């Protein structure tokens, strides 16, 4: 048996209850009966009680999570839960769907996303199709900067092409302070391509400052990873058109589709399992007692869970709590302040919607500009 939880969307939660009311989807090769839980607000005590009490009340085997307004520092609690009660969980979306690299030793979190190295290789692959090679790296004083800088430095030295790098800059991006030191320094730059890694508020403040000190015209291009851009459904202001980022697949899908996907993953795991051992794995659950050394049966179950298929996709998990061989899409800001697809990535080859990068003037009319001569030939 499995359970599901919904979080932090009132009017949608009515549709969530309506879609929970069906007996089953009647497709999964299992006879597990779901159960639903709904929590008013996301808080530590609330989540702790509503998860372990529910888990110990009705003898469940597995649980799957659902996202929220995407406020940070929420996955750690679920990781602690997994460590304590030794029960596998699964995240599907939202801010909780961000990689948490040094997970607890004995846990099994299985949050789907993209690791920073994989999340970064795509920008270098797309930066070679047009071959700009400027590399003005801007990083804020954020906790995750150390791994990012090390990864980019390591990749730069083992790549295919020369990749001339201009310089690296770090700056304080706090909510309040004297701007002058960063403001004068930022304008002391010259590079056609920028890559920046920071948080949402840091993105707002840096982008406003750059727009103030004339670095947002049609000549430059910005690259940001998935850690930024927040909602993915609400377009904020002050964003210069042309921002490029990379996000995973199924972003435009529905919550019902995502929860069905998670249910299918766990069901296919169980379906592959019962053939090996003959029955469902024993459900270990105890909020209060907290026993358990390393258990070989549940470890074997976790091993058998790591590889699935079907539904026109793939989910192969590494020892780290993240999937490998991923399928994501390049996204960009269209001329009407709206997100749209640009490029796909399937099996280590890259594509693009356009053969050239448009770039935009102040008005809707683009500037063809000089150079980039069109040349024709035939076989």
């Amino acid at each position: 048996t499995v359970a599901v939880v919904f979080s932090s969307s009132g009017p949608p939660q009515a549709q969530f209850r309506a879609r929970l009311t069906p007996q089953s989807f009647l497709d999964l090769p299992l006879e597990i009966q779901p159960l639903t839980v709904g929590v008013n607000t996301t808080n530590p005590s609330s989540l702790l009680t509503q998860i372990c009490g529910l888990l110990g009340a009705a003898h469940v085997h597995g649980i799957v999570f659902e996202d929220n307004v995407d406020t940070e520092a929420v996955a750690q609690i679920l990781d602690f839960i997994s460590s304590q009660t030794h029960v596998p969980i699964l995240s599907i979306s939202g801010g909780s769907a961000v990689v948490l690299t040094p997970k607890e030793p004995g846990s099994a979190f299985l949050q789907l996303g993209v690791s920073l190295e994989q999340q970064l290789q795509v920008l270098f692959k797309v930066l070679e199709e047009y071959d700009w090679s400027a590399f003005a790296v801007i990083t804020s004083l954020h906790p995750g900067h150390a791994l990012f800088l090390e990864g980019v430095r390591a990749v730069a030295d083992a790549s295919h092409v020369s990749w001339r790098l201009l310089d690296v800059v770090t700056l304080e991006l706090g909510p309040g302070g004297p701007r002058a030191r960063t403001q004068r320094l930022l304008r002391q730059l010259d590079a056609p391509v920028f890559v920046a890694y920071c948080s949402r508020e840091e993105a707002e403040v840096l982008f406003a400052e750059a727009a103030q000190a004339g670095l947002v015209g049609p000549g430059h291009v910005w690259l940001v990873p998935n850690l930024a851009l927040g909602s993915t459904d609400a377009p904020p202001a002050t964003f210069p058109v042309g921002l490029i980022s990379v996000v995973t697949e199924s972003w435009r899908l529905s919550l019902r589709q995502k929860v069905r996907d998670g249910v299918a993953i766990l069901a296919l795991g169980a379906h592959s399992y019962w053939r090996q051992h003959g029955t469902l794995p024993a459900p270990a659950g105890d909020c209060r007692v907290h026993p358990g050394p390393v258990s070989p049966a549940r470890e074997a179950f976790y091993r058998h869970l790591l590889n699935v298929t079907w539904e026109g996709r793939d989910f192969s998990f590494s020892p780290g709590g993240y999937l490998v061989q991923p399928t994501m899409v390049v996204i960009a800001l269209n001329r009407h302040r709206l997100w749209e697809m640009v490029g796909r990535w399937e099996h280590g080859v890259l594509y693009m919607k356009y053969p050239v990068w448009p770039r935009y003037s102040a008005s809707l009319q683009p500037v063809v500009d000089s150079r980039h001569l069109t040349v024709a030939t035939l076989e």
């Binding site: 607000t41 609330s46 609690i77 040094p102």
Partner: protein, 653 residues
């Protein structure tokens, strides 16, 4: 103007200690401006229940900071984690005093956390200092595979590659396992006399006992470890001498609380002066927001100067540790620890004591354990090294050369298996030839006993990109040399850019170029038949060879190599047979081998002049002592003419 702080402890009297400390803080600092309250709760075993109780207590008060210590229970990791996580969701700072785990040093997972004692990691830095003071250069690294182990090692190679001398082979073994004899058996072959260890307390006795069993604890070899392995050693498995270290006020838990209360009381005034005092209060239902200025509070707290040293001046490092600390060096003789030297901020100061090493020699032992036995690898090669089956007795036929001398022979193990299809079988054979004579000459020149064993897979060696990986991996004889199996290569090796980065080949002893074989209008550099390919005149060569890289460094000859890579042989003999068989049209590598083969096996000729220049030479691992003398001696031998004399015996016949 009432500021409340909390703390989680276990000693019922320690709450009175905190109360006395805050009373002293009120009596010392402050003047009719702000008063500070205090309260604390005792730890409870059920971790989740402890978290719930702590968050409810925070709900019952307007706390600003949390302070925790080590309870006596052996489940060390259990106590700090829940309060830390439930604090991270609010960014309320927490300071630990007696928890030294390394996972808490990663700012990504624990948002706000400060440790008042240096972690286990900087033992690597003090180890580097101790290596500097005692003039020790080569160190073997024996660390476990746990997260603490990799962090400690990482700091170590950073501070060592600061000198860029690099470390010897680093050995990783799984935690919580026994029968670790294999790792030490592998280490025993290598030459080193200083060994360093860092692991779990229980595993220390396990790894210790095997050392006594394998008598590695004799003289010469020397031990040194951190405090982690100090306690469990004397418990049940007697030591044999170990340099170590400890902290001054370890596990006192009295000075630390005073220091932390002092520093937070110093910080609160500066915070109140910041003109933006947003009160947290205890919203545990609906107050889903962060205390608005936590980042600035943490930033200024990290910058706090030492309030009062008392027991010791305390500051904070950039990562969140305490820089400029001290350690006491101890020794393990007669099962009674004694101080021998005192660590300063950077340097170490001995103090009128006598140091003893496991052997019993009073004088400081000399490291680097210079060796005398050498390993050598070689490959099958037509004109340079003959390999022939041994005779039935165990040696092989002791024939006589025509020119009144016996052809010297040596016993070579070899794999006795060809191609990846055939499984490993092995059989001792005997080897002889030009290079073997060159080697046995060196045996007359200096003192060392060779043990020749042939190559594994029969490939000369190239650099290949690992399939779906980050780093390229070497393959073949060069890879075996770089791994550490042997320390020299005596084979017809070409010198090129790809090899010169790692292994220093010196003083070439025989020059050679490149030619092409045909059976009997081709130009080697560029010919219409070869520059433009067809169904006839197929160009092919042996795979995983230097010529592969050389052709891979071209432009249209790059396309030539691209269509050549579709075909590949695994040995020279196959090509020699095919040239007669006319199935293969062309063949391209080193001039000397092909010239000798054409001289011996008639009806075959080489076409075109040499289009390249190179040299053959021995290769050693970098920074090896033998290189200077072997290069010096080979030139004298060449000047004398013995190399010239051997040629007519083996090249011109």
């Amino acid at each position: 103007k009432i500021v409340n702080i909390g703390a989680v402890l276990s000693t019922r009297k320690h709450e009175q200690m905190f109360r006395e400390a805050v009373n002293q803080a009120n009596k010392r600092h402050g003047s009719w401006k702000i008063q500070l309250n205090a309260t604390s709760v005792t730890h409870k075993p059920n971790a989740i229940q402890m978290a719930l109780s702590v968050c409810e207590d925070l709900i019952s008060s307007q706390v600003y900071a949390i302070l925790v210590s080590h309870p006596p229970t052996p489940n060390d990791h259990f106590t700090p984690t829940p309060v830390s996580y439930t604090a991270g969701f609010y960014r309320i700072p927490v300071l630990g005093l007696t928890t030294r785990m390394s996972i808490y040093s990663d700012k990504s997972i624990h948002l706000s956390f400060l440790r008042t004692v240096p972690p286990y990691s900087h033992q690597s830095s003090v180890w580097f200092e101790m290596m500097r003071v005692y003039s020790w250069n080569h160190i073997i690294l024996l660390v476990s595979d746990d997260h603490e182990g990799r962090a400690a090692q990482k700091r170590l190679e950073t501070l060592l590659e600061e000198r860029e001398s690099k470390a010897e082979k680093v050995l990783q073994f799984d935690p919580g396992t026994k029968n670790v004899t294999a790792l030490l058996m592998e280490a025993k072959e290598l030459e080193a006399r200083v060994i360093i260890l860092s692991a779990s307390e229980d595993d220390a006795a396990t790894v210790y006992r095997a050392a006594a069993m394998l008598n590695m604890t004799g003289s010469g070899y020397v031990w040194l470890v951190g405090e982690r392995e100090i306690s469990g050693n004397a418990l049940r498995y007697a030591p044999d001498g170990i340099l170590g270290l400890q902290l001054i006020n370890g596990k006192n838990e009295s000075a630390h609380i005073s220091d932390a209360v002092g520093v937070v009381a110093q910080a609160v005034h500066e915070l109140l002066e910041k003109e933006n005092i947003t009160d947290p209060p205890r919203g545990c239902v609906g107050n889903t927001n962060i205390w608005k200025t936590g980042p600035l509070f943490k930033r200024v707290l990290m910058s706090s100067k030492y309030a009062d040293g008392v027991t010791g001046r305390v500051e904070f490092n950039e990562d969140g540790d305490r820089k400029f600390a001290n350690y006491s060096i101890m020794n393990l003789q007669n099962r009674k620890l004694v101080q021998v030297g005192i660590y300063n901020g950077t340097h170490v100061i001995p103090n009128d004591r006598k140091i003893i090493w496991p052997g019993g020699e009073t004088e400081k032992p000399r490291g680097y354990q210079m060796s005398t036995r050498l390993k050598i690898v070689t490959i099958h090669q037509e004109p340079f090294v003959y390999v022939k089956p041994t005779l039935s007795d165990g040696t092989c036929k002791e024939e006589f050369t025509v020119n009144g001398d016996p052809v010297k022979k040596v016993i070579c193990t070899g794999p006795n298996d060809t191609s990846p299809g055939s499984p490993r079988h092995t059989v001792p054979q005997c080897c002889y030839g030009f290079c073997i004579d060159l080697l046995i000459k060196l045996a007359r020149t200096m003192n060392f006993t060779y043990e020749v064993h042939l190559v594994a897979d029969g490939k000369f060696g190239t650099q290949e990109r690992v399939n779906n990986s980050n780093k390229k991996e070497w393959n073949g004889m060069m890879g075996e040399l770089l791994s550490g199996q042997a320390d020299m290569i005596v084979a017809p090796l070409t010198i090129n850019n790809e090899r010169a980065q790692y292994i220093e080949f010196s003083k070439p002893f025989k020059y050679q170029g490149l030619t092409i074989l045909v059976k009997k209008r081709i130009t080697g550099i560029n010919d219409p038949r070869l520059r433009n390919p067809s169904d006839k005149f197929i160009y092919a060569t042996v795979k995983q060879s230097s010529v592969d890289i050389y052709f891979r460094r071209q432009v249209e000859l790059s396309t030539m190599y691209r269509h050549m890579e579709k075909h590949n042989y695994e040995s020279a003999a196959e090509a020699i047979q095919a040239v007669r068989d006319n199935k293969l049209h062309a063949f391209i590598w080193d001039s000397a081998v092909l010239e000798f083969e054409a001289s011996q096996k008639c009806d075959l000729v080489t076409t075109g002049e040499l289009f390249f220049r190179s040299g053959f030479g021995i290769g050693m691992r970098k920074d090896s002592p033998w290189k200077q003398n072997v290069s010096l001696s080979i030139l004298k031998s060449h000047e004398n003419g013995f190399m010239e004399d051997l040629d007519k015996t083996w090249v011109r016949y």
